[PDB]
Each structure stands twice: as C-alpha cells, then as structure tokens.
Design a protein around this ligand. Structure first.
Ligand code: AMP
Length: 465
C-alpha cells in the first residue's frame, strides 16, 4: 500500500489517522470543504489536500477512506467505485492500525475521549511511547493523534453505526452506556447494548475488559460478557474502587482500592467525580499492564486534558469588556447530552463554590432537543445565568416545539431563571459581555458552532469587536 486518500480529511477522527499514516511514510491525499489547522498540518507533512469534492481528487489512490458524514453521492466516492478502488470507513482504517499492535480501545457513551487522553499520558510517562488516536485534541501533544515507537495503540472506540465492531483490541474499556432518546422501535436500546457486548467479544479469550460497575446498564450487562472483566467505580463491589473523593479547584483528590496493592492516594488534574471515574478506568488498565504507581500518579497530577473538555481558556479583566472591576473565568465544553452538561455544571459548582455560573448554550440537533427535552430543561435550570443560541441544526429540518425559544419558555415558566435568547452567533459576544460580573465562571457549552465562539471570546479576552 502506498497512497491513502481521505474524503473529509479535515474533521476529527479522519485527521489523526491521516497524521499517523503520514509519519509512517505512506503517501497521503485528502479533501475537505473547510480548510483548518488539521489540514494545514497535514499539508506540512507532505499530504495533498483539495478544498472541494471533485472526481479527479481520487486519482492513483490505493484506497479511499470515508467518514459516515459523507453522502453516497460524493463524487470522490462515486469516482472511486467506477475505478474499482477499495472504499472503507474511518473505523476500518483505525482497525488496520490496530491489527499488529497491542490495541487498547476505549468505549462508552460519555468520557471516552478523556479516558483515552488519561491512558495516553500514563503510558507516555511510563516510557512506553504509545501510538494514540483520540476523538479530541490531546493538549499534552498538541494533536488528536501521534505515532509512537512501541507496539501500543491507545484509541477511542466509537459506537455510532457500530463502527467499533471493526476493532480487534487486546484491552477494551466501557465507561458507561446511556440512551440519547426513547426507543423509536421496540428493542432500539437493547440493540445498542448488544453492539457493546459484540464489541467486547472482539477481545481475544486472553484479553481484558475494564467496565464501570457504577453505570446501571454496564452492571446489568456483566453476566453476558464472556471475557475477563475488571470493574471500577465508587461501588463497594468494584475491583478498583474510588473513595474519599473531594474536589479542590480544578483538582480531584481520592483513594483507589486495587487487588494485591495497598491503597494509593491520587491527585488528579481534572475536575469532578466523573473524571475520577475516567481515571479509575485508566489506572485499572495501567495496573494490569504492570505500570508502576509512580508513573501513574505523576501522569495524573500532570494531566493536561483535551480540547473542549472543561477547557480553561483564561481569566480576563472586565474593565475593557463592560467597564466593571474584576475578572471572569472562561471554560469551554463540547458536552451536548444532558448528562454531559450536568457533569460540567457539577464540576464548576464544586470546584469554585463562590463563582456565579454563566452558561452560553447551543443545543445540537432538533431530534436530540426533542428527544431529551425534559432533561435539558432540568439540567439547564441549575445555572445562575443562562444564554441560549438557536439549535445547531447539523443538516436537520426544524421540529416545532423543539427549539431554543421553546426550551427558554419552559425554563422561564418555572420562575427562577430568566433565560436570554441570543438571536445570532455574531451577537453572542455582546450579549455575554453585557451581563458579566466579576467572579463569574462562564461555560461556553455545546457541540456545534459554539466551539468557534469560545475560541474568539478567548482571543479577544471577552471584548466585543
Ligand atoms: N464518566 C463520565 N460520565 C458522564 N459524563 C462524562 C464522563 N466523562 C466525561 N463526561 C462529560 O462528557 C463530556 C466529555 O466527554 P469525552 O469527550 O467523551 O471525554 C464532558 O461534557 C464531560 O462533562
């Protein structure tokens, strides 16, 4: 194999893979409508990137890799089949990187990316220079992915469209399994659970599963997993148990109980009980591998996190923003499921009890807003000040009653918060600027467009332009 071409090379997922393959010496080609930092970096490494989707782009390719976001109509794909050039999905290419490596695949509905980042830090510190492919930018490395010199591959495993079923790992983690909607058809959620079981059965017989016993669905699935399992959680029956948890600012402090080890004291550079869970998963894997406690503890105290995961972008003075004294703290989170938003709020609340929580939220998709409406209203009602942008459609047509204004009505009608509707993405900075007080903790929360707003708020220090 010589020339790999990626349709949608600019997105997360595709970019990391392309970068690892470039460093291994393969010829790399790609396409994307929106050039970004990832596409520039790929061009720096020798890849040829096109900012359009045309059939000429697939010429001489040994294989064409496609993300699930591309439509079957894409001329690159069409042109590929015409030429009888194999076309595979992102996940099949990730599977090939894992083929001759000691794969550690991290799955779950929430926490996958963070847990993958925590494992990568531990293995790097232990001098095991791992190859890794993560769904978020690993801040310690400045990238989503890196080629390592060892046989290890640490990677996030995506359950969407059962992509993770192509992976053949040696170790697999399941952080939790939660529905993001009610069953459209009888057995919808049961089907999803079965794919996780099928994923774990991709482990060889001598392989290992690390599962969160605190998650009700994961606990219920244990008996059906015919593989060696190591459980973790605050639960009393956990193989790796968290206890004496307390949060101090951005840091978590707790003990971990493991078999044939005395209690260890951990200081984690990430906030919240949910990050303690993610860390426990990582430590469980690290311990079965034989990594020393000093390497583990140093990795966790120094953890640098991932882009857009409770990402502190700065404390900025308000005088030039709205003429008030003091400063405001800017935190960026991509969390989009009500569980994710709630965990972020809890971390901010527990970490900085005296700060006022100001959230700028952008719901992602009408289907999801409609499906988890009640949960969004309950979770969003917990902040002190709420600003809401219009639902990020992600290609979907609107659903009446499942929009930001409706959600704002439901929350306001409870008589505690008076949410602020932000009619524009361009108006967000001004409307935020106007209500900021000293000692505010701002959560720019959401998976779509809001990511750019966060970046710009940081670049301009909260000053409207
Ligand atoms: N173990 C967990 N359980 C629930 N939510 C989590 C967990 N870990 C991270 N999160 C939330 O999910 C988002 C990040 O997840 P991820 O990108 O998968 O690490 C953030 O909003 C976190 O608040």
């Amino acid at each position: 194999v010589r020339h790999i071409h990626f349709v949608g090379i600019g997105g997360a997922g595709m970019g990391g893979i392309a970068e690892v393959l470039a460093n291994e010496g393969y010829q790399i080609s790609g396409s994307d409508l929106a050039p970004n930092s990832v596409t520039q970096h790929l061009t720096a490494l020798g890849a040829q990137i096109y900012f359009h989707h045309r059939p000429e782009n697939v010429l001489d390719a040994s294989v064409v890799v496609v993300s699930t976001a591309i439509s079957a109509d894409n001329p690159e794909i069409v042109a590929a089949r015409e030429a009888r050039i194999p076309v595979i999905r992102r996940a099949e290419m990730l599977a090939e990187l894992m083929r001759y490596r000691h794969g550690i695949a991290v799955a779950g509905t929430h926490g996958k990316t963070t847990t993958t980042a925590m494992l990568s830090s531990i293995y790097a510190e232990a001098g095991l220079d791992p190859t890794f492919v993560n769904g978020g930018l690993v801040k310690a490395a400045g990238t989503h992915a890196r080629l390592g010199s060892s046989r290890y591959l640490i990677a996030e495993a995506d359950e969407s469209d059962a992509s993770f079923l192509h992976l053949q790992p040696m170790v697999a983690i399941v952080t939790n399994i939660e529905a993001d909607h009610m069953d459209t058809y009888q057995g919808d959620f049961e089907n999803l659970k079965q794919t996780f079981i099928n994923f774990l059965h991709n482990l060889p017989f001598y392989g290992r599963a690390v599962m969160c016993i605190d998650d009700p669905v994961v606990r219920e699935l244990l008996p059906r997993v015919g593989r060696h399992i190591t459980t973790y959680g605050f639960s009393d029956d956990a193989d790796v148990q968290i206890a004496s948890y307390r949060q101090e600012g951005p840091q978590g402090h707790f003990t971990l109980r493991r078999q044939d080890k005395p209690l260890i004291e951990v200081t984690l550079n990430a906030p919240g009980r949910h990050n303690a869970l993610n860390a426990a998963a990582a430590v469980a894997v690290a311990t079965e591998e034989g990594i020393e406690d000093e390497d583990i503890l140093r990795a966790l105290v120094g953890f640098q996190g991932t882009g857009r995961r409770f990402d502190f972008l700065g404390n900025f003075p308000l005088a030039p923003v709205n003429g008030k004294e003091g400063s405001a703290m800017l935190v960026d989170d991509y969390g989009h499921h009500p569980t994710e938003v709630d965990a972020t709020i809890k971390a901010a609340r527990a970490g900085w009890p005296d700060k006022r929580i100001v959230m700028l939220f952008q719901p992602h998709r009408y289907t999801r807003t409609r499906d988890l409406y009640d949960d969004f209203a309950n979770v969003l009602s917990q902040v002190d000040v709420l600003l809401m942008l219009d639902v990020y459609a992600a290609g979907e047509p609107p659903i009446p009653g499942a929009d930001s204004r409706a959600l704002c009505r439901t929350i306001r009608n409870r008589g505690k918060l008076d949410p602020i509707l932000v009619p524009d993405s361009e108006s967000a900075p001004e409307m935020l600027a106007q209500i900021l007080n000293g000692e505010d903790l701002i959560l720019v929360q959401g998976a779509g467009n809001i990511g750019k707003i966060a970046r710009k708020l940081a670049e301009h220090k909260l000053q409207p332009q």
